[PDB]
Design an enzyme around this catalytic site. Sequence first.
Site, PDB file in Angstrom:
ATOM      1  N   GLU A  54      -0.270 -27.678  24.146  1.00 18.37           N
ATOM      2  CA  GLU A  54      -0.194 -28.874  24.980  1.00 18.37           C
ATOM      3  C   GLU A  54       0.901 -28.755  26.032  1.00 18.37           C
ATOM      4  O   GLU A  54       0.692 -29.114  27.195  1.00 18.37           O
ATOM      5  CB  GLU A  54       0.027 -30.109  24.108  1.00 18.37           C
ATOM      6  CG  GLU A  54      -1.074 -30.349  23.089  1.00 18.37           C
ATOM      7  CD  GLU A  54      -0.793 -29.692  21.753  1.00 18.37           C
ATOM      8  OE1 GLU A  54       0.021 -28.747  21.712  1.00 18.37           O
ATOM      9  OE2 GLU A  54      -1.390 -30.117  20.742  1.00 18.37           O
ATOM     10  N   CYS A  86       4.518 -32.628  20.930  1.00 16.89           N
ATOM     11  CA  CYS A  86       3.461 -32.610  21.936  1.00 16.89           C
ATOM     12  C   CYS A  86       2.939 -34.009  22.229  1.00 16.89           C
ATOM     13  O   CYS A  86       2.415 -34.257  23.322  1.00 16.89           O
ATOM     14  CB  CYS A  86       2.322 -31.701  21.481  1.00 16.89           C
ATOM     15  SG  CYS A  86       2.866 -30.074  20.916  1.00 16.89           S
ATOM     16  N   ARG A 186      -3.822  -5.239   9.922  1.00 20.37           N
ATOM     17  CA  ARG A 186      -2.388  -5.131   9.677  1.00 20.37           C
ATOM     18  C   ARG A 186      -1.597  -5.998  10.649  1.00 20.37           C
ATOM     19  O   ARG A 186      -0.600  -6.619  10.266  1.00 20.37           O
ATOM     20  CB  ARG A 186      -1.942  -3.675   9.779  1.00 20.37           C
ATOM     21  CG  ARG A 186      -2.233  -2.854   8.543  1.00 20.37           C
ATOM     22  CD  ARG A 186      -1.579  -1.489   8.627  1.00 20.37           C
ATOM     23  NE  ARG A 186      -2.013  -0.618   7.543  1.00 20.37           N
ATOM     24  CZ  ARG A 186      -1.544   0.602   7.333  1.00 20.37           C
ATOM     25  NH1 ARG A 186      -0.619   1.131   8.116  1.00 20.37           N
ATOM     26  NH2 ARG A 186      -2.015   1.310   6.311  1.00 20.37           N
ATOM     27  N   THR A 198       0.056   4.690  -5.402  1.00 22.42           N
ATOM     28  CA  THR A 198      -0.299   5.017  -4.026  1.00 22.42           C
ATOM     29  C   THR A 198       0.919   5.496  -3.247  1.00 22.42           C
ATOM     30  O   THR A 198       0.824   6.433  -2.445  1.00 22.42           O
ATOM     31  CB  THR A 198      -0.935   3.804  -3.347  1.00 22.42           C
ATOM     32  OG1 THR A 198      -2.022   3.325  -4.148  1.00 22.42           O
ATOM     33  CG2 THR A 198      -1.461   4.174  -1.969  1.00 22.42           C
ATOM     34  N   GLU A 296      -4.282  -3.182   0.113  1.00 23.71           N
ATOM     35  CA  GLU A 296      -4.945  -1.930   0.446  1.00 23.71           C
ATOM     36  C   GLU A 296      -4.704  -0.895  -0.642  1.00 23.71           C
ATOM     37  O   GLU A 296      -3.578  -0.737  -1.124  1.00 23.71           O
ATOM     38  CB  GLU A 296      -4.452  -1.362   1.779  1.00 23.71           C
ATOM     39  CG  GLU A 296      -4.886  -2.122   3.013  1.00 23.71           C
ATOM     40  CD  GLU A 296      -4.121  -1.682   4.246  1.00 23.71           C
ATOM     41  OE1 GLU A 296      -3.146  -0.916   4.095  1.00 23.71           O
ATOM     42  OE2 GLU A 296      -4.500  -2.083   5.366  1.00 23.71           O
ATOM     43  N   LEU A 302      -6.343  -2.960  -6.926  1.00 25.64           N
ATOM     44  CA  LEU A 302      -7.556  -3.641  -6.489  1.00 25.64           C
ATOM     45  C   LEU A 302      -8.293  -4.272  -7.661  1.00 25.64           C
ATOM     46  O   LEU A 302      -8.762  -5.411  -7.566  1.00 25.64           O
ATOM     47  CB  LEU A 302      -8.470  -2.664  -5.752  1.00 25.64           C
ATOM     48  CG  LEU A 302      -8.117  -2.349  -4.301  1.00 25.64           C
ATOM     49  CD1 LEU A 302      -8.829  -1.085  -3.863  1.00 25.64           C
ATOM     50  CD2 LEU A 302      -8.480  -3.513  -3.398  1.00 25.64           C
ATOM     51  N   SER A 304      -7.007  -5.196 -10.558  1.00 23.97           N
ATOM     52  CA  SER A 304      -6.212  -6.306 -11.068  1.00 23.97           C
ATOM     53  C   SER A 304      -6.363  -7.544 -10.193  1.00 23.97           C
ATOM     54  O   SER A 304      -6.465  -8.664 -10.704  1.00 23.97           O
ATOM     55  CB  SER A 304      -4.744  -5.897 -11.166  1.00 23.97           C
ATOM     56  OG  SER A 304      -4.254  -5.461  -9.912  1.00 23.97           O
TER      57      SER A 304
END
Lengths: 350, 350, 428, 428
Positions: A54, A86, A186, A198, A296, A302, A304
């Site tokens: 605005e 605003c 991301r 990982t 990722e 994944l 879990s």
Amino acid sequence: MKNIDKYYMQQALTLANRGRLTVSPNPMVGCIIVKNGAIISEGWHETVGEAHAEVHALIKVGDKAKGATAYVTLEPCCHHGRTPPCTDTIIKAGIKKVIIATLDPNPKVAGKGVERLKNAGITVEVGLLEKQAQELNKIFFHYQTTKKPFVYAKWAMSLDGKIAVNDGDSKKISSHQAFVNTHELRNICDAILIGKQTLIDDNPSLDVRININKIKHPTRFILANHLTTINHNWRVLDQRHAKTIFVCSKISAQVATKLNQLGIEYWLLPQSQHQVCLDTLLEKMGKIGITSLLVEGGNKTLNSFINQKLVNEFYTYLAPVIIADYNPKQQLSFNQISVREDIIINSCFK
Amino acid sequence: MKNIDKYYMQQALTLANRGRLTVSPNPMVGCIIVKNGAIISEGWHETVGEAHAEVHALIKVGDKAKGATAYVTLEPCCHHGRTPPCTDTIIKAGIKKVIIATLDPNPKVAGKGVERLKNAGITVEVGLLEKQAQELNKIFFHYQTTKKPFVYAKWAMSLDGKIAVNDGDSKKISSHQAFVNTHELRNICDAILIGKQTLIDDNPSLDVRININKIKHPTRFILANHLTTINHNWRVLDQRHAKTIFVCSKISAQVATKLNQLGIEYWLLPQSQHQVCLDTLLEKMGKIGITSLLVEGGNKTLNSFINQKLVNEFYTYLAPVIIADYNPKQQLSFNQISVREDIIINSCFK
Amino acid sequence: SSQIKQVFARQILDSRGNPTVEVDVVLESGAFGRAAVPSGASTGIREALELRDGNKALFLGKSVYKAVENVNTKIAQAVKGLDALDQRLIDKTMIELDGSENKKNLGANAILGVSLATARAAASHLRKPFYRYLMDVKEYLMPVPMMNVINGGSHADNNVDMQEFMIVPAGFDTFSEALRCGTEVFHTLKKVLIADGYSVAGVGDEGGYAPDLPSNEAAIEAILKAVKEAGYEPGKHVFIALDPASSEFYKDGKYELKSENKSLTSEEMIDYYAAWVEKYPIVSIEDGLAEEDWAGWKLLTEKLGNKVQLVGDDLFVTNPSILAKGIEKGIANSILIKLNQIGTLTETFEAMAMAGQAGYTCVVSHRSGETSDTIIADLAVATCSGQIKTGSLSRSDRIAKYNQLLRIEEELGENAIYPGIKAFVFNS
Amino acid sequence: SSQIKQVFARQILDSRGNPTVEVDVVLESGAFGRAAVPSGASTGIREALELRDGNKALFLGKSVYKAVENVNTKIAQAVKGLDALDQRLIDKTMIELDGSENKKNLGANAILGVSLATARAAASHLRKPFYRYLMDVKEYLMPVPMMNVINGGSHADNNVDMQEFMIVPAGFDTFSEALRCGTEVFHTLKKVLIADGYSVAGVGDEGGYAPDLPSNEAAIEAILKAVKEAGYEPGKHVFIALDPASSEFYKDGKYELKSENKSLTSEEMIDYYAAWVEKYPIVSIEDGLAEEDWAGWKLLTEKLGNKVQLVGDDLFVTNPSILAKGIEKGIANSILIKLNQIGTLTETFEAMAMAGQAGYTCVVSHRSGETSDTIIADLAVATCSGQIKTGSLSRSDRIAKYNQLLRIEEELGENAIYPGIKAFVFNS
């Protein structure tokens, strides 16, 4: 034309969608000021901390908006004292009619701006293209209604259902479009979550490596049930670009002292269902400031997250690759992909 | 019009494809007879043991084919026992010119029908649309050049890469189109192969359960490394529709006596790479008469066949479900599928 | 899967404001094809029959509700589930279902629409262009356009006894220069016809002018003057094609030229044509004699078969049987191909294949009542026929074909060949 | 992804044998859009200008190679990578890149083609019909067509001062009966004009007849007797629409009616129009006065704004600024919308939204140099302003729009409604 208000609201939602990659944790807001049937203003929220839609729409027009009409996709903020509200800018500009798509998702704030506008005699209509404007802001609406982050699950797999490759392989099961989609997600998300396995296997850096006008590196979360080993050559220990947080349930004294020396913050949470308490972790991330979360990689992490039904949307990168006892994976070539209720795939090479 | 020969050969190839489902182990052959620029004959090979394509085409035109031209997909048989020699029928009918797409795939037979035709003064041209006529007959060409069956690998998997559901669910990860495709592949193939574990878990009957012209039940092969247990309630022990062969490396005496009483034939093969010798099994299959092989189900059997490079073509049925640590499947729903070098899939119903 | 899932029909309007049938075919894989049927003859003795309601309370008497209903019931329940990639099976299925030689029971428009829509759906299923689906070769020949510029006897009341006069831009290396030549010559012809005091008020059905010319010699001289005034040389860049259609003024064995008020036999009529042949750069005579006068046709092919191209439209009516009789009797030099005159695509292919093996040249033709469909351009490119007859440069139903040809010749940029003057195989 | 991957342009021919720009746009996901630009004015001070080479060795002077090259270099490297679903972004990008108010540097044809092709590609990407992409509502209004039956002074040599006479079939419950009525009245009008010994052979650019009528009264009476000869009652089923385009015979403040040999001022010209208004079932007067005579326009809106609908084409030239001036001055009660006159889709939407909030009715219009694209039918359906001016029932560039409207009317069976006489908002 007979559906003029719908046309102007649709243009407002397009302007709101213009700020897709750079507005979190603030929502998507567009605005259109129409006087004498001619659009003379345009505004959209583009970056966190800058002018609202605005204000960005009404500063450029000066005071020629006296008696105009405002199409705003979200309720203007009034309780927010960080900046002049605003609603104050709308009232000082001289808008006679304000049309709002949706109310504010927060129940304590919802309706305050409408009442504050209606004190000054402004005409307020709420409910035009409400479903589209709620689907556009799904992340913010979910975070405000639940106080828990929005969860994205994304992984890549071969044609036979294997995520990881054998030792020594090139570790590429994705094309360039998958790369672009991954880095866009991301940029959108406020956090990035991986597992300890990982980290020790791939040693990844969770930054953004493509071209965006405003690069927004997500906060890194490292999930580990037991913390005993800390490696100096880990790339996540560099705090120059983003912040790394270790989630754990039982941490060694040496590891704790090393993290305190390194400046890495650790979170201690109870154990539930062979993992840490994921609900408590989601509550803590919601309280501290993360709006959307991205998970990722890692079959354990994944699985879990899937088993607790905490995922809101999925992404799968399927490549024409067969993963077997082969040291190098053998490429394939698709022939017929018939997309229906269930995908039916034919592969000829190999 | 400038490419008339290619047009007639394309029509012959279409007639050849008209017999796609019900010709194995015979090949797919069409035939056009053209006299005075007008097509007055048509033929294709359907059913095993019936009239050949040339005989089917030339039996309707008893004497109007004198001086005509023949467009025939495959080289006519000379000494093979499928039918009385079609070269004799061509010579007696009075065909002036014969155009052949490909030679016979067997080296011991290739080039002899051409010589027999050219003895009688018939003009023979070989090589028109050869590549398409070799791709149309890929199964027969592979079987004749290699003396090993053509093999299909077909399985269904979920979005997370799991083939088998948890114990207690409906065991359905496929739709009706997958059902139709599976039964058409069953009708085409001359054999069906599963594992011992798949038969124990599912107890399947490998017949054809769709509405098509001629049902051709495949031959059943049951692969079992060790044979010790025989169940009376197995559905494959019924020999009314097809035949069942047990492949093994070690078989018990009681099991052998029970199979001899039941009339089931067992094959004893050496052990190689935690399986039976698959190359010897393929050689025996080629020797006994099977032309096409179909491998369905079983992670053990599929993995054994895939990493040994036996498989020629693949088929994957991907459904929008999640199979992880729950008795009922979490049904998903796709939102958008972008098909490129690698499939990128998005879904949110969980 | 390429099996037919749905067949639907509609009553739409063609370029002349008359109803016609449009058919949509959808396969199981989602491939979609759409085909509109140009209007043909609704009565006759040796041509495929077109079915109309014959209701005066409807449009005039010509509505196609019966044909649409015949599609939607009979053809839809007949051809459902068949493979769309087998054109022959579907075509002979409809032929056997109808059960008549002239397609009286179901009408030729219904059958042609279903066949063309099925072909388009099959081409879309394979992700191929229609011309590449019909014939998949490497080198393609772009057609030489014959462009109608003057319309005479039946098309106007201007005492010109011959029907059509046409220009053939055959002296160029590409189709783009030929189209530019046609455009410039058309505009200069309009200017010349204005400068001579002739009324050019309006345009005809085929996009060509219909001025009140006094004689055929005046028409040919005006065309040549337009060619000279447009910057091109007659006889090297632009030739002239004819269309007398002498079936109109043939009574009691006499060819009656009303413009000159003459009655001629056959032999003097070919003598007149020959005088024109070495009088002008004229290489085409379509329907130069009547369809019942086969002896004169044989004599004309004897003593003018090696000097011009002889085209037969009412003589062969795109019929394989009549064409075979003409071949065995040695009559004419070319054939004009129309899709709806036989009713199916496979019979059209058979007729053109017979013409090709006999040594004749094929000319794909348009009709008076045309649609926005551009089948004939892809048909002429696919079969490598070096000629096409798709009208003048004045209307969208005549310009869409040329636009499609331009898109094709830029899509096939290396592999498109324009046979300028070699496309007329009448000498050596 | 919906980002623009490739933009290509080529020179094709329009319905009048003149070059025009045709643009293809391909997105990253493979979505494909195609747009052809109808020909407009290449000079002026009010409308957006069209760029032409002016080469005499080329077509005439009308080659559009510079516009195509401007696309392929400048616009292709400017709009590549932008999201095709944000029409405002691409439109304002082209406006800023061009840098002139009348689009002189790049030409309006290039910009309009790029914008329309981008819109079609975005609509194909979402798997939507184009009218549903433009406006996604539940209930839709089918347009009431005006069918140009008679052409006049500017389009032919008629000794008729009036320009266009049209029929409006507004007394029906569906668009199908309206189209049938238009077709039947067209055929009966041809027969009637033949019966009175008039020259009818031929057709105009918009499909309408141009006979040598003696006066405007004769033309209106001929139209009315053609209406009542085809089975429909005038004034209940078929009304009359006018198009004087009075800028042609305006000189030194005097309206010169050369057919009746009169020189009239403004107020008596409105008096003549009113005599016609309660003389005939006439409800439309498009450009009934000159575009420079605004005082007469105010008088006409004062004394005839509640009895007929006054349309402005040369008065407002699809310009938001001139339309806003006319609204604040209170002139006319309708506007004729042409896409080519402004150059972008977003400015067209702005003009029609201004007209809608002012209380005016919008009429989507066509051009003389039309193409095979049928975008105006989808535009008229999408915005639910039911009135359209897309020519008569005589040629494919005018028939394709009605065919598209028939398809839309059958695919929206429950949710498409036809506002027969309620679409003329001029009383109460």
